[PDB]
Every structure is written in structure tokens, then in C-alpha cells.
From a paper:
The Membrane Attack Complex (MAC) is responsible for forming large β-barrel channels in the membranes of pathogens, such as gram-negative bacteria. The MAC forms large heterogeneous pores by the sequential binding of single copies of C5b, C6, C7, C8, and up to 18 units of C9. One such tool, the monoclonal mouse antibody aE11, uniquely recognises a neoepitope that is present in C9 only after activation, either by the assembly of TCC or by C9 polymerisation (such as polyC9), but is not present on the native soluble C925. Here, we determined the cryo-EM structure of aE11 in complex with polyC9 at 3.2 Å resolution.
Numbering used by the authors:
A (entry chain I), G (entry chain F): 20 to 126
B (entry chain B), F (entry chain E): 20 to 140
C (entry chain A), D (entry chain C), E (entry chain G): 18 to 202, 233 to 318, 348 to 477
């Protein structure tokens, strides 16, 4: 029942530029955060778990870190493949709650 | 390789029951569990429940009375049944997998394709 | 035949505990192995980790005007700097401003080792003493003492002990019986029986513990606090195994010994000359306490029955002073020691009572299948066994010879 | 068969005590375990924390023109600075300006260890002595002394003891009996019995305590002051267990010993020669007081029954000076010591009296089930048991052989 | 007739483990070798490298606020720098800033060798003790101690040990029986049997382990973590052979000895003078514990059956202190020690329970074919064999003489 | 997931009894206590009564002779019975959980939703 | 019945300002005070218990202090989601008593 909040819902950037996505929690989840990527046609994929580790099969450019109630995800060298929607999730208390989602386009 | 499918009836009446059978392959169900997530259109994800490896299960408090999940590891598929239907219950339904058979903080690793269900008269 | 252990089906899982993050279930025992059967494994609980729904928010009252020790125990402010350790880890003596004020005020005293272990925890089944749950290094800023007659030395008395008297006394006993029957008419018959019993006790001191306002050691309070709120049989059974089910509120110390000897004879002559001669002997000796040198020599001398000198008896009685044992107890239930000012203390006490009652109900010899020819049933590590008399030498006391 | 321990249902919770912040309830015991039954747990109380409605306003009147010790005990101003400790922790000796004035005026006197522990509290069931409730280090600015002839030393007398007489005296008693009956007519029969009893006592001194204006230790006054105002069986039973029910207003000190011998014989002849011979002996020895070297030597010398030298009697006599015991008592109730100057002291006295009557009513041998064939019933730690004569060796004294 | 070992066909291959990169299969044994047959090789498992389908991704929850040892073991921050080793390799002591703070704080304690090996692992078949799974060098920042009466030295008590009591006690026993029947009518008959039994024990101490929050060595935890997630009979059997099936939660230490003597005579004469004389003797001795000089001398003296002096018994009792054994046990299942905070720990517990059932069910003498004329069957390394009584000395106990 | 729902009659006669039900969720009533609190319009809150997990009941001094609290731990429901109502009893009735099993200084962590009851004058 | 008084029945301030609400007890309650927040339509929520302790799920802008008899609840960096009425309640002697209630407005 932890309420996950993401400030922004849209962002625009050019190729070769870095951006950052922030997600904030109500309670303290003890570094239990995950980041997903929902490209069109409903393909969902796991990017980052435990707020710092990188899933096998994810490009190394993706990076994210944080502690307490504030976490961030950093996208460096933005490429047209990374045009999708990124959510956050907590796992420390039941039931698991997702995020609002930020649309990242190229403009 | 790990792959999942959902099948499904697609269209149902606004007062009947829904039934979805998620078929998994590439991993035995005895040592893993499968979750259920729905995404309302133009909205974020929402968790519904999970079935453990040994047959235990947990449900969401929001819809706990009218939800049921059944398993059959011999046939390698998981069933989902909801007794009641409303126009709000229109979303895309996924089946996922945890890092273990259950009982610990989890991150859903491999995702299924997910089918669209619309309910109307 | 042979009887194998059989155990009951499991119960239902509990809900997730917000603080332990575990769930529990339990089962029961029906039959112990007997007659070269399989003994029971005694795994009567189960645990599995879960994900709680609510955060663990646990709070207890602060000391207030009292000092806060680094181990969590509240003590009085006046004990900030003196000659004694009260927090249990010398947490208060590390910030002494100036002018230490020992409570005894230059008086010469000694720390008695006899009173440092008083209040042994005792399992109701087997009567095995355990480590004491009390903390006897706490003095509460007093200089209570008492004198020992043999050494003219004053021993300081801890807080928890309410009475400690050094006394000299001894006991002895020697009862013998002899019966003899002779029947003849040819025909003949002769009977002879003889019983012996020697027993003696040596007393060293006696102590009385307190009831209200006690101070317990930190580990005991930590293990109490870890108990589940609801009733789970496995966890409370484990606590009762670790810490016993009752504790010695008072007792005596010293040493003792015993000797039991039984003689049996029989005969019968007929006249086809049929003559039979039956002789059955059994000697038992025991000894506890003292030093490992004099005591075993005295034990071996007692077994022969030969006349021996008093000097070895005196040597052993004098050596009792350095290695005493626990000869008498007065049991009190363990749930009386639960601190009053604690979250859900009454629920813990009720559950501990129920768990003691269930522990007594289980592991009971009464469930063992009866033996034959008046044999005695003993329970030993989840396996029933029969003890047979002189004439019968069977496994189940069935072979007569 | 077998009888298990059974207890009555619980009573109703009382109102919240505004100062203790607790409520109490109690139950009773109906039957004790007997014949291999379950012994009683003796849980007759319950307590649980509550929330008061009104704040606890607790106070006692201050000394006034008297000095106020740090423990609360009021002493007179003339005792502010002298040679003795009256506050119990040398609270009055910390401000001696100048010109100390010892009370005894350089005379050579010693602290008597005999009178330093006088006034033992005694439990009515079992007669086990406890620690004295009085504080025998208060002298009230007096130098009363007394002479011991053996050492020609003068020993100071504390305030609380009203009499201290050192006296030497001895006693003895030696009674033997012998019977022999012979009946024959074929027929024959021979019977014989023999009884021994030796006992002698050694007296060292005798003391008498005071009645009016006595001084008790701080801890006893604090334990009294924490008692609930109303009548709660559990808490007052705990007080009785901690401090006993009576205290010795006068007594003696020294030592004693005993020796008890029983012989029994019988025969019976018929004529088919049927002959029977039964021989039964029983010897008991006891000794209290003295030093653990000579005392146990004499205990052993007594058993063999040979004639011994007088030197060991003299050695035990001279060593009795260093470890005396309580041979004779004269009990007084403990509620007579409740201080007059206290909140609701009379109610505490009434409650203590009723609780002592109730404690006598329970734990009584009268609820134990009777034995068979003239057995003797003894209650020991909440479990009735039977004692059998020489002829019967059954558990219920019913098997004859 | 001779019987050879035969084993069942292989099972079906398992799937490929993503991390172990191996697959497993197993079989079963049908008959053990008997009567000069082929013994079983007891090869019940098989494995072969494979190629996984998914990458090996294994991670566990970090310590968090607690310190991370170099071996992975999470310990509290307060134990970072003191006088004791907690990580198991002094990994926390290499960053001591200054002023190390021992927990004992100038007290004199010694490392007890008796309590350093408490908690031996015990295989249920044969009752052979193994190395202890516990790590008894971890004290958790406390200085609990205890005194030994014989040496007057205080020994430190490890964290895992929940009880440590030094006590002196011994036992002895001597039972002998003798029967003799003579029947005659010419004709004759003689029967005679003689049985002896001598056994004694020496007690040195007693220990009790913990149940909740125990600390194990890293090797046990790593051997646990290498198990397959699913159920593979071979791997769990190998684990159970390596670490036994049970662990000693409580036991005693000391030494003991025994002696058994059986004598038989027979005669039967008829008159054609037919005369027969059968004579049977049996002498057995045993001795465990103590030092190899006094103990062997005592075993040699006792075997002759002559009366010996007490000084050898005393010397051997003294040497018992330097080489003890495990005389009493209390077995608990091995799966109770699986740490809770681990991936699929409950699966490992269930699988180890099933594996112990399978391990007890197999390797059982119940599959051995019965012997003849009351023979006793013993299993030895996959080869059944028969034990025969006095009169019969055949391989299968079939030859009568 | 701790939550409480409330149900009330809504309309009662100026001399007719009350019957209010506070069902709990997410926890068991055996190890927690429940408090009842009402808020008259235009004014502050007021503590009314409490029932422990054990079965004991505490009441406010003024309304001791009128209140009555009952518990059914099988169905996880709490009842309130007030008789001989006046016109001043019109308020918003909450039910809130206790700090612990009961019998200590407390804070009400989890509240209900609120039910208004009007007494016709 | 302990009587607790909240003198400021109303208070008005702007965003980003520090506001302090004072609640004074009659007896000495031994550091047993709690603070509740009531948004409109009758929602209640415990923020501070034991006079300095943040309840789980409450942001860090709220903080309390005080000892003995006088207590205060301090709100820092006021926002548009902090327009409610705050109560003080004691829990030392039953029956428990609440304060008058202070309604915070924004100008
Ligand atoms: C108990 O066991 C002993 C051991 O031999 C036996 O002699 C006795 O008859 C049994 N039963 C009783 C009631 O003592
Ligand atoms: C009481 O028990 C003793 C046991 O020694 C016995 O001698 C006596 O006869 C019994 N009965 C009475 C009335 O003393
Ligand atoms: C068991 O084996 C022993 C081996 O010495 C033998 O004496 C005995 O006869 C066998 N059978 C039985 C029933 O004890
Ligand atoms: O009731 C049978 C149950 O017994 C217990 C456990 O062994 C469970 O796995 C099993 O299903
Ligand atoms: O739900 C938790 C699970 O716990 C365990 C078994 O008793 C199951 O039947 C149960 O479903
Ligand atoms: O009424 C019987 C009584 O027995 C006792 C306790 O178990 C009480 O809780 C109970 O009420
Ligand atoms: O059936 C026994 C089987 O054992 C295994 C393999 O060695 C197979 O080749 C063989 O067939
Ligand atoms: O089919 C999978 C194969 O696995 C391996 C062997 O056990 C084969 O006999 C089996 O067919
Ligand atoms: O109010 C009286 C209370 O006393 C106590 C227990 O017996 C409770 O069950 C009871 O309700
Ligand atoms: Ca101190
Ligand atoms: Ca003075
Ligand atoms: Ca260290």
C-alpha cells in the first residue's frame, strides 16, 4: 500500500544527451526498487533491480542509484531504441505497487 | 529459453466469469511461482496475486473476495478466475515470474506477452 | 511385533508477522517406537519467511528520570559511578566524573561463588539443572554480607538472593532385613532374602530467591521479547527446551551417596534326586559431589563392604566445600519471571502456561504400550523400553528362565 | 489409581491501583497430585498493568527536628556526627566538622557476631529460618557491653537486642528398652525387640529482642510500603514467601546430635518342619553445629557403637564456638513489626493476618488422601506421599512381605 | 546357495541446472550380498555436465546496516573492534583505530577445550560422532564464565553453548546369577550356568546448544548452498554422509567400562558307559576414554578377574579429564539448522527430510535374508552376515555341534 | 492493508437504541483492541469506550450506564449499543485500533471512515 | 479529566513559512502526547506520537518538540496539501482527552 510517485510524466531529449528519471516512495523500502521499460506493443522488460544492480541483457549505459525514499535512473547516450515508458516498483511491503510512468520521446 | 503465453476468451458479458490459462515453458513450476498483473488502458500497472511453487497463494486486498488462482504443474499452466465483471475491469493481463518460489521480496524477471480483454454487453 | 513412530498431519500456516517476518505451523506425536522400532525425530514445528503487510513499529516506555544503559536496561541515576557494575557491561563506569564512592566504604568482603550461581533453571522432565536466568552481579548499591564459620570470612550477598546461611549438618542411615523359610516333608525347600540400604547426606548452605523487583540478564529478556504474539507450539517448546520449564526458588547444597544390595536364594530337593540352586545378586552404588580424587576412592571402598577408616570419609566431607551439587529444590513456574512493563506481557504469560501444559502432556510415558509380567516402562529419547525382573530376561520381559 | 493436580477457576479482576498501576486476581488449589500424579505448579496469582484514573500522590511525614537520612530513616540530631553509622550507609558521617566524639570513649570492645544476625524470620511450615528483618548495626549512642568468660572479651550490644547472656551448660539422655516373649505348646514362637535413643545438647547463649521503638532495615520497609491497600492473596503470599510468617523474639544457640536404633525379631515353628526367621534393623544419626572436621568425625564414631575417647567430645565442644545454630525458638507474628507511622498500616496488618491464616489453610496435610494399613502421609513440594513401616513395602503401604 | 548384489535400472535424467551446470539421476538396491556373495558398491547417484538454458543469476539480500565480513557473514557493527574474533578470520580487527576494548575488561578467563568441540554431528546408522557444525569461537561481545571445582579456574563460555556445568559423579554395578540342576535315576544329568556383569561410569560435565539465532561455520553454509533446488537423491545422500544425519543438542562426557562372563557346563551319563561333557566359556571386556597408559593397565588387570587396588581406578579417573568421550546424546534432525534468510531454504528443509527418510528406509537389515537357528543378522558395508550361538558355528549357523 | 469499515442505521427514534458495526481487516482482533470515538458537530473529539483483545471493556465516566460493547472474534466484528438516546448524541462515530493488545498508554494508529447518526427531535 | 487548551483557534500563513502550534496540558502527563491531522470530510491520521516520533508513512516536514507541560508541533516548508486542523491528545490517564483544534489556513 506504499504510494509510489513520479514527478514528471513526459520528457524530450536529443541523441547523445543524458537525462534522469526520479521516483519517490512514502516509507523506507531498504533499497528495494526496480525499473522497467514499456515500449509500444506491450513488451515489458526488466532493467535494474535492488536499485543498483544491472540485469543480464541490459546495456551498460543504464545506471541508477539511491537510498532512503528518493531514487533516480540515469540514461546516458540516448538512442532511438530507448523511446519508451519507464516505471518504478517497490517490493519491501505487500501489495507491490507500481509507478505512474514517464514517457520519454525524442524532440 | 523462457516463454509464456496467456490464451484467453477475449470478450465476455458484463455479469459472467472470466477464465485465463497461462502456459509456461522452459522452467518447472515446482520451484517457481507465477504472478498476475493488469494494465488499464492509458494507466499504470497493478498487481493482482501470485501462486507459489508449493501451491500457496496470496491475493490483493482490493479484489480478494472475487479472485481465484489454480495451478497444475503436470500440465504446466496456471488458471485465473474472476466471478464478477464490471466495465472498470478492462485491461491487458500478464503472467510473470519471481526470483524464487516465494516468501521473499521479488522482482519480476521474465514477462509474458499479455492479451487484451474487453467486457461489454 | 515392532512398533514404528507415526506423526500427525500439519496444521494451517499463520499470517505474516510484521517484525519476525515468518510464519509457523505445528503437528503432534501419536506413538513412540518400541520393540526395536524407529525412534521419533521430534520435529514438531516449521517456519518459512514471508513478506509482511504492515511495518514493524515497536516501542516501549523510556526510563524517564532513570539512567539508560547501553544494553537497554533502565537503572537508577544514583548508580552512575560507584564500585560495582550494574548495566552488565560496565557502561556506567566509563563516565565517572570524580570522587568514586564505593558502597562498602573500605570494608573487606569477598564475592561468594556459592551465591553466584543460585537459582538454577530445571526441566520438569529429568530434573536436570541448567544455567541460572538471574543476574547475580547486580548489587543495587548495598553492602549486605554474612560470615562463614570455617574460614572467618565475610561474603557479600547479591541483590536477588534473599537469604544465604552457611550451616554444618549431616545425616546417615543403615537398614537391613533378612527373611528365611525352610519347608520339608521326600521333599525340601529353602528360601533366603536380604535387603541392604545405606544413604547419607552432607549439607553446605541454603538460599532463598526473591519474588518481586528482580533483575534478569539481558539475554533472557532478549529471548523473551522475540516470542510471537499468537500461540505457536514449536517456538514456545523451543524456548522451554532452552531455558527449562521451572526454576529453583530455594534449595540446599552439598553431596550425597547411596548403596542398594539385594540377595536371593532358592532350593528344592526331592526323592529321582532333583536338586536346584538359584542365586541372584545385585549391588548398586552412587556418589555425587566433592573432588574427583577422594570421592572415587570412597565409592570403590563402599562397594566392597569391608570395614574402612574414618579419615577418607572426613577427607571427602571436607572436599565437598569446593565442588558442591544441588540436593534439594523447590520448583516455581517459569512464566512468573516475565517482566511486567512490556508489550503484551499477559499474552506471553498465558501462552507460556499453555505451552508448559502441552509439553507435560507430550513426551509422556503413559502413551507407551504396556510391557509384560509387571515390567516397568521408561521413556528415553522418544523410544519406549521395558525393564524386567530377576526371573524374566526377555526384550519385552517374555522369556522366563 | 493416580490423582492429578487440579485447581479452582480464576476470580474477577480488581480495580486499577493508582500507584502500582496493576490489577490482581487469584485462585485456589483443590487436590494435590498423589500416587505418581502430576505435582502442582502452585500458580495462585496473576497480575497485569493498567491505566489509573487519578495521579498517585504518595508521601510520608518528614522527620522535622530530626535528621533525614538519604534512605528515609529519621535519626536524632545528637547522632549527626559520632563514632557510629545510623543512616545505614554512613550518610551522617559525611559532614563531621571537627572534634569527633566517639560514644564508648576509647574503651576496647568488639562487634559480637552472635548478636549481629539475631532475630531470624521463621516459616511456620518446615521451620526453616530466614534472614533477620532488623538492622543490628544501630546503637542509638550507647556503649552497652557484656563479658564472655572463655575469651575475657567485652562485646558491644546492639540497640534492638534487649538481653545477651553467655552461659555454658550441657545435657544428655540415654534410654534403652528390651522385651522378649516366648510362646510354645507341636508349636513354638520367639519374639524380641530392642530400642535405643541417645541425645545431648550444648547451649552457648540466649537473646531477647525488643518490642517498642525498634529499627528495621530499609528494604523491609520498602517491601511493606509497596503492598496493595486491598486484600490480594497472591501478593501477600509472595510477601510471606519472601520474609516468612514469624520471627524469633527469643532463642538459644549451640548444637545437638541424636542416635536411634530399632531391632525386631520373630520365629514360628510347626511340626513338616516349617521355620521362619525375620531380622530387621534401622539406625539413624544426625548432628548439627560445630566445624565440618570434628563434627563429622564424631558423627561417624557414634555409628559404630564402640567406646570412644572423650577428647573428640571436647574438640567438638570447643569448635561449637565458631558455628552455632538455632536450637530453640519462640515465634512472634510478622505483622507486629508493621510501623505505626505509615499510610494505612492497620489495613496492612489485617491483610497480613488474614493471608497468614489462608496460607496455613492451604498447603495442609489435611487435603491429602489417606494411606492404607497405617501409613504416614507427608506433603513435600505440592505432592502427597505415604510412608510405610518395616513390614510393608508397597507404594501405598499395601504390599505385605 | 549364494546371493549376489543386484541394483535397479537408472532413472530419468533431470533438467540442466542453470548454475551447477550438471544433471542428476539415481537408482536403488534390491538385494545385499550374502553367503560369500558379491557385496554392493552402494553407488546410488550419478551426474554429468550440461549446458543451461538461462544465465545463472543468483543474489541475496545484503546485511544492510550491519557490517559485511570478508566471508559473507553479517555481524553487528558494535563488534567491529574488540579483543575477540567474530568474522572468523579476524577481518574486523584490521581496522582498529585505537584503544581496543575487550568485553571482559580485565577479568581473567581461559579458553575451555571441553566446550570448544560441543555439538558433534552423529550419523543415525552406527552412532559415530562427527565434526561439529558450530563455530564456538564466536562470543557476541559477552564475557560469561564458570568455575571448575577441581582446578579453581574460570573458563569462558561460547555464545552457542547454552549450558556448561562441571559436576562429579560416578556409578558402579555388579550382578551375578548362578543356576544348577542335578537329575538322576543308571542315569545322570548336570546343568550349570554362570553370568556376570560389571559396569561403571564417570561423569565430567554436560552441555546444551541453542535453537534460535545460532552461528555456524562458513563451510557448512557453503555446503548447504551448493545443493540442487529440486530433489536429487544422490546429492542429498552425499550431504548426509558428509555431515551426518543428526546433531547432539545435549550430552555428557567422561568414560566407562564393562565386563561380561558366561560359563556353561553339562553332563549326561548312562549305563555301555556313555559319557559326555560340554564346557563353554565366554569373557569380554571393554574400556573407553582416559589416557592410554592407566587405561590399558586397568583393562589388563580387570580381565584376569583378580582383586586389584584402588589407586589404578583413581589414576584412570584422573586421566579421564584429558581424553573424554560422548557417553550420552540427544539427537535432533539436521535440517533444523538451515538458516531462514536464504533462497528456497524451505525447499532444502523438505528435501533433506525426504532424503533422511529415504536414507533410513534404504541400507536396512530388513532386506537381509534370515539366518538359521536363532541367528542374529548384522549389516556390514553392503554384505549381510550371521551371528551364531554357542552350539552352532556354521557360516549360516546351520552346522550343529 | 489494515482497514476498518462501519455500518449504521442512519435514522433512529429519539428513544430508540443504537446498533453500530465496525468490521476489521488485515489483522486479528485477538491481539489488538478497538476504541470508539465520536465527534459532535462544531466541536472536538471525545473518547467513549474500549474493548481489549482479552474481552475486558473500559467506558468513559459519564456514559458508563448507557454504553455496551460486544465482540465476535470469529467474524471480526465489533458492536456498540447505546440506549435511551437524547438529542445531543448526534455525532460522527469512528472506530480506531489500539496501540497494543490493551492495558497501557496508547495511540490510535489506524482509523475508520466515519458514520453519522442523527437523533430526530 | 485532564483539560488541554489550544489557544490559537485559527492561524494564517503563506507557503514555505514555519508555523508552530502550541498545546498546553493541565497535569503533568510524563511525555505522553500525540498529534493528529484532520483534512476535510472527516479523515484522521496520526503524525507524531510520544511527542517526538514520526509515524510510518508521514513525510519529514512535520516535527514535534517540548517536554514537561508545554509542547509544540512545528510544520516546515508549508505546501498546498497541509490545509487541515491539528489535534493534541494525551494518553496517560483515562479517559483520554483531545485539544480544542487549530485550523490552519493559507493566505
Ligand atoms: C520397574 O522396573 C524395575 C526394574 O527391574 C522392576 O523391578 C519393577 O518391577 C518395575 N515396576 C515397579 C512398579 O517397580
Ligand atoms: C507413620 O510413618 C512411620 C514411618 O516410619 C511409621 O513408623 C508409623 O507407624 C506411621 N504411623 C504413625 C501413626 O506414626
Ligand atoms: C544375536 O547375535 C548374538 C551374537 O553374539 C548371538 O549370541 C545371539 O544368539 C543372536 N540372536 C539373538 C536372538 O540374540
Ligand atoms: O497433510 C500432509 C502434510 O504433512 C505435513 C507436510 O509433510 C506436508 O507437506 C504434507 O502435505
Ligand atoms: O496459505 C498458506 C499455506 O500454508 C501452508 C498450508 O497450510 C497451505 O494450505 C496454506 O495455503
Ligand atoms: O473461567 C476460567 C478461568 O480459568 C483461568 C484463566 O484461564 C481464565 O482466563 C479463565 O477465565
Ligand atoms: O539400465 C542400467 C543403465 O545404467 C545406466 C547407464 O549405464 C545405462 O547404460 C544402463 O542401461
Ligand atoms: O529421454 C531422456 C534420456 O535421459 C538420459 C537417459 O536416462 C535416457 O534413457 C533418457 O531417454
Ligand atoms: O472486566 C473483568 C475482566 O477481568 C479479567 C478477565 O477475566 C477478563 O476476561 C474480564 O473481562
Ligand atoms: Ca555502578
Ligand atoms: Ca552517628
Ligand atoms: Ca571482533
Amino acid at each position: 500500500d506504499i504510494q509510489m510517485t513520479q514527478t514528471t510524466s513526459s520528457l524530450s531529449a536529443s541523441l547523445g544527451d543524458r537525462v534522469t528519471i526520479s521516483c519517490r516512495a512514502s516509507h523506507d523500502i531498504s533499497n528495494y526498487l526496480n525499473w522497467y521499460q514499456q515500449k509500444p506493443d506491450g513488451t515489458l522488460k526488466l532493467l535494474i533491480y535492488y536499485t543498483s544492480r544491472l540485469h543480464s541483457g541490459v546495456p551498460s549505459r543504464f545506471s541508477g542509484s539511491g537510498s532512503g525514499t528518493d531514487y533516480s535512473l540515469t540514461i546516458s547516450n540516448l538512442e532511438q531504441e530507448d523511446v519508451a515508458t519507464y516505471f518504478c516498483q517497490q517490493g519491501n511491503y505487500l501489495p507491490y505497487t507500481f509507478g505512474g510512468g514517464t514517457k520519454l520521446e525524442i524532440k | 529459453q523462457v516463454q509464456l503465453k496467456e490464451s484467453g476468451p477475449g470478450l465476455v458479458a458484463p455479469s459472467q466469469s472470466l477464465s485465463i490459462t497461462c502456459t509456461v515453458s522452459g522452467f518447472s513450476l515446482t520451484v517457481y511461482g507465477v504472478n498476475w498483473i493488469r494494465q488499464p488502458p492509458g494507466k499504470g500497472l497493478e498487481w493482482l496475486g501470485m501462486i507459489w511453487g508449493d501451491g500457496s497463494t496470496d491475493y490483493n486486498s482490493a479484489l480478494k473476495s472475487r479472485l481465484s488462482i489454480t495451478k497444475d504443474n503436470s500440465k504446466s499452466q496456471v488458471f485465473l478466475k474472476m466471478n464478477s465483471l464490471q466495465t472498470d475491469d478492462t485491461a491487458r493481463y500478464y503472467c510473470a515470474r519471481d526470483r524464487s518460489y516465494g516468501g521473499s521480496s521479488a522482482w519480476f524477471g521474465y514477462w509474458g506477452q499479455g492479451t487484451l480483454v474487453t467486457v461489454s454487453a | 511385533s515392532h512398533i514404528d513412530c507415526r506423526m500427525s498431519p500439519w496444521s494451517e500456516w499463520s499470517q505474516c508477522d510484521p517484525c519476525l517476518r515468518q510464519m509457523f505451523r505445528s503437528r503432534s506425536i501419536e506413538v513412540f517406537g518400541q520393540f526395536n522400532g524407529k525412534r521419533c525425530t521430534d520435529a514438531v514445528g516449521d517456519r518459512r519467511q514471508c513478506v509482511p503487510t504492515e511495518p514493524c513499529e515497536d516501542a516501549e516506555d523510556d526510563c524517564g528520570n532513570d539512567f539508560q544503559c547501553s544494553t537497554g536496561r533502565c537503572i537508577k541515576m544514583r548508580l552512575r559511578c560507584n564500585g560495582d557494575n550494574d548495566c552488565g557491561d560496565f557502561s556506567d563506569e566509563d563516565d565517572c566524573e570524580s570522587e568514586p564512592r564505593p558502597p562498602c566504604r573500605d570494608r573487606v568482603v569477598e564475592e561468594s561463588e556459592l551465591a553466584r550461581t543460585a537459582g538454577y533453571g530445571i526441566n520438569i522432565l529429568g530434573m536436570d539443572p541448567l544455567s541460572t536466568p538471574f543476574d547475580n552481579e547486580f548489587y543495587n548499591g548495598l553492602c549486605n554480607r554474612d560470615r562463614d564459620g570455617n574460614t572467618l570470612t565475610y561474603y557479600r550477598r547479591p541483590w536477588n538472593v534473599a537469604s544465604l546461611i552457611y550451616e554444618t549438618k549431616g545425616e546417615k542411615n543403615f537398614r537391613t532385613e533378612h527373611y528365611e523359610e525352610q519347608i520339608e516333608a521326600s521333599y525340601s525347600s529353602k528360601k533366603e532374602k536380604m535387603f541392604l540400604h545405606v544413604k547419607g547426606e552432607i549439607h553446605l548452605g541454603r538460599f532463598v530467591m526473591r519474588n518481586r523487583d528482580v533483575v534478569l540478564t539481558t539475554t533472557f529478556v532478549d529471548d523473551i521479547k522475540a516470542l510471537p504474539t499468537t500461540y505457536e507450539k514449536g517456538e514456545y517448546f523451543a524456548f522451554l527446551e532452552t531455558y527449562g520449564t521451572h526454576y529453583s526458588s530455594s534449595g540446599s547444597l552439598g553431596g550425597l551417596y547411596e548403596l542398594i544390595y539385594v540377595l536371593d536364594k532358592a532350593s528344592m530337593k526331592r526323592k529321582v534326586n532333583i536338586t536346584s540352586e538359584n542365586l541372584i545378586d545385585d549391588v548398586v552404588s552412587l556418589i555425587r559431589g566433592g573432588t574427583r580424587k577422594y570421592a572415587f576412592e570412597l565409592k570403590e571402598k563402599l562397594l566392597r563392604g569391608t570395614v574402612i577408616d574414618v579419615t577418607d570419609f572426613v577427607n571427602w566431607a571436607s572436599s565437598i566445600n569446593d565442588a558442591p551439587v544441588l540436593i534439594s529444590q523447590k520448583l516455581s513456574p517459569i512464566y512468573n519471571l516475565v517482566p511486567v512493563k512490556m508489550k503484551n506481557a499477559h499474552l506471553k504469560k498465558q501462552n507460556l502456561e499453555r505451552a508448559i501444559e502441552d509439553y507435560i502432556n507430550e513426551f509422556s510415558v503413559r502413551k507407551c504400550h504396556t510391557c509384560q509380567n509387571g515390567g516397568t516402562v521408561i521413556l528415553m529419547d522418544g523410544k519406549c523400553l521395558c525393564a524386567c525382573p530377576f526371573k524374566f530376561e526377555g526384550i519385552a520381559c517374555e522369556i522366563s528362565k
